[PDB]
Amino acid sequence: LIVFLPLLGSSVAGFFGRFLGSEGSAIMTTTCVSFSSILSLIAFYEVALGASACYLRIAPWISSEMFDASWGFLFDSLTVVMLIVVTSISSLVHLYSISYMSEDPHSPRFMCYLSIFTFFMLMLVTGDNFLQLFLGWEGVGLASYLLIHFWFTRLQADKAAIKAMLVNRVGDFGLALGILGCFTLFQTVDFSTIFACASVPMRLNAISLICILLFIGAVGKSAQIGLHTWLPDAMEGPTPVSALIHAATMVTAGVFMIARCSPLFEYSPTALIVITSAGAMTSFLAATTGILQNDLKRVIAYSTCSQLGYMIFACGISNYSVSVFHLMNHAFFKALLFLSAGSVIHAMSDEQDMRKMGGLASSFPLTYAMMLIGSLSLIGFPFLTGFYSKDVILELAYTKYTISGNFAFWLGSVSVLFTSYYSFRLLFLDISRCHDAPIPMAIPLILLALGSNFWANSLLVLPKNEILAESEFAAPTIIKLIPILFSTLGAFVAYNVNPVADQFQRAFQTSTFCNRLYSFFNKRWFFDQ
Amino acid sequence: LSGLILCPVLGSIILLFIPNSRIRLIRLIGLCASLITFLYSLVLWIQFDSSTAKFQFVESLRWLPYENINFYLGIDGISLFFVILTTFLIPICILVGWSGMRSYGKEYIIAFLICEFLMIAVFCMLDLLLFYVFPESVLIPMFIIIGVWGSRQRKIKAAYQFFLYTLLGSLFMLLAILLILFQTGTTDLQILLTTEFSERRQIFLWIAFFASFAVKVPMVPVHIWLPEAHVEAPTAGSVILAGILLKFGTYGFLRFSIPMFPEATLCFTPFIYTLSAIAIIYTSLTTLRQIDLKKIIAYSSVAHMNLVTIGMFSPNIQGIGGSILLMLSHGLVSSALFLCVGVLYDRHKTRLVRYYGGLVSTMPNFSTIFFSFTLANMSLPGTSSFIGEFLILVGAFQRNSLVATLAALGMILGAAYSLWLYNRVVSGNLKPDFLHKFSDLNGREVFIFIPFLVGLVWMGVYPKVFLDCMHTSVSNLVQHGK
Amino acid sequence: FEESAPDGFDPENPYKDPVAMVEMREHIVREKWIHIEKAKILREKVKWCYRVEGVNHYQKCRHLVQQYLDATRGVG
């Protein structure tokens, strides 16, 4: 047993937390009032970070008849990778919770749900065949819900979150219909040779529709623009909770499936172009309509939408490994700035004033100060990103233009304009202490700022597979210079006092003020009403 | 089985000679008789061999000499754990009734009228004439359980025109049973299996069985008896209704429809497809209209049962396995939810639903367990109901997956409203007018909850011990359907 | 778990011998499970191929995996 550790922690904290006491690990029970905490889950959990590649084998699970027992995973170029990433994320969120928790008496049950979220995400990232994957896949939908309404302060928030979770559910059924069609066609579970099986052969253009149904699932579990289940709701719940959903179960779990099924999107190029179309359109539209949002918390999600649309596009352009490494690094950075958001919301929990353009960027903590680092090294500058995981595949999108022939999308498929614009839209826009980032809160931010090459260089460890021949390409190299200046525009333009072009506030020519997308792109994206 | 078969009847009758106003003895001994009949059901499980087309423990006694329409008692495959679930659940009803006085609700009367194992009979009864007698027969015990100690919401009654149709459908099946009985003298189910009918008549006989069944099954044109029967049903009358009385129709289809009329079943596959599909769609959307909690759970049960139908169609071993395991998981989950809503009634003594509020303060362990079972009624992958429903789904195995696409709506709306109602019940610090009477759950209460959660998790993490003990029988059924 | 491949005596027209007709069902389903478990054993052997290669882990067995799959036909 190496994976079920957070499940064990959750199962013990679910009941023993309110009947055990001071220590509750093995002895010293209710010597004082419980004050029990995540302490058990942490002391049991932190070991899994030592995962390193050496052949490991399988273990029984639900021994259905058509299916197989002896489930698990065998070691390849993604298993321990995703394992260490997700356990790092979960440890992050657990420490940040025990910081941000201990005031709401539903805390024990909450962090229980948190580890159940982690365990469903595990059963995703550790399933040998996609049936355990679907187990964990609706597990993380239910877990996103169970994590949404912990704070529970407002009820109509949930009265909207129900129609929200409709979309989590329909995505999980996208996956269910997909896997049903798989076993109607494949008859098997093993991912190795199913590529050879389905690569040769209702509508009778079935297999392509299968892959697209898998895509529909990967997106319906997500929350980006029109499939957004968690945007209008998730921030009333604790900040590391929205961090968890947006990082892991929005996209990471959605795409770890299609990456375990990377050969299954390989065998259908029609499927690949349908992924690329929707991915590029989602990135483009999220970043584009992401104009003038006014808040102090939700703008991280207002970024995540496009910052992951581009990445699902990366998965769909046949650069699955590239999108994977992009997602590890983006999880890191976006989690750093999620925890920055949580720090400043705890600041709002210590006082209720907006500061005068000097305190909107720092209350003078060094522990939290790494918010600038996280943001700017996320934005797509050649520090460790930009050409890395974004612009090299955009140099591939140049050739995608060369193929398709529309000189609109992949020219501006980089959204550094929009990303940089609303980034600063967040960076800008009763006395409290100069010590406002607690230590048990900030140690996670410290180690994850530390977190920021043999994966970023993918054509080395996995060089020149059959059709995985991509990267440098017959490309014009002008993109090694051009989008840096879109980045620089989005960097310096926002340094004014009025970033919005004047007369954008009132609409143009005085038509109906409802036709602007504000009421549209917050509630289910309301595109075709 | 020979001796260990008649435990509930012996117990009931030998207790009938103990009126015993001092309840302690009748409660204790009825509960012990129930628990030992359940123990003999479970040792009968252990006694099972998952390798024969024959039925496991066959017994009989001459009932009418010519043509010998006798009590042929088989327990192969499905019936094995159907009777197990029956026993599993009957002590649950006996145990939900440790009420102190229990005076007007005369305890021995409910003991004697729940401790009638005619459900055991029908699930083991393997000659569809006497098998016919029992589901129709259990209606007399069900009617007394439904209203004698049942909550009175109306002048106790059932829709009279619907009830007349329901019983007319039951007797229409009786004409079909006789037509097959005299068609070739075939008394029992083994020989009704062997025999071969006229395709022109197989369809008529199939729909004639289907009348009574699809009344017992809650299909879209006739299912209204579940909500009205439950909202009036007692706490232990609903536990039996959802538990077994719905399994009646699906087990009837399973034994006396699929391996009986293979050509008629082949011909009517799309019929039941669309019927159960639209039924699931309706019962998924309806709980919008219904605010009554018992009606809510009853309609979720309709949804699950028409899923059982949309899966039993198949010659897919996985298909009918998902059907029967959704039946087991449903007899667990809907009955656990009826236990829940009965506790929620009694602890609140109110029959409006808007009044269940502030539950995390009054009974938070009830909140935990209510979620532990509402995740199941929406079939959280991992629960037993998930294994059931997904083998139902893959039941589109040799198929082309067009009814799974209607199960799409049927189950997505189901899970949606499951979460909505679990919220609506536990939502907010909505202070009710109960005068600080918290009503924390009882140790016996969490006890009677224990076995359902245990069966649920033990299936949901390890369905082998139930899919095994079944595959041989279902596969024999399928080849006869081949 | 001790059965016999012969089904007694059943002609093509099965109405005649209900004993033999039931026995053909009960052991031809045994043969059904014979070849179903043969496909399952060959699938565990497909996993075994994958385990062995680990570097190709699609090739050197993939056409033999097509042979495996030929335990099933009529994929349309």
Binding site: M202, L204 | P270, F271, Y273, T274, A277, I278, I281, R399, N400, L402, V403, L406 | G74, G76
Partner: peptide
Amino acid sequence: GIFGIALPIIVYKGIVKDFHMQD
């Protein structure tokens, strides 16, 4: 609409029939 679903349900039945005619 209800009769619409009633007839489109048997229409999906007919779609299964068209798939049966596909082979």
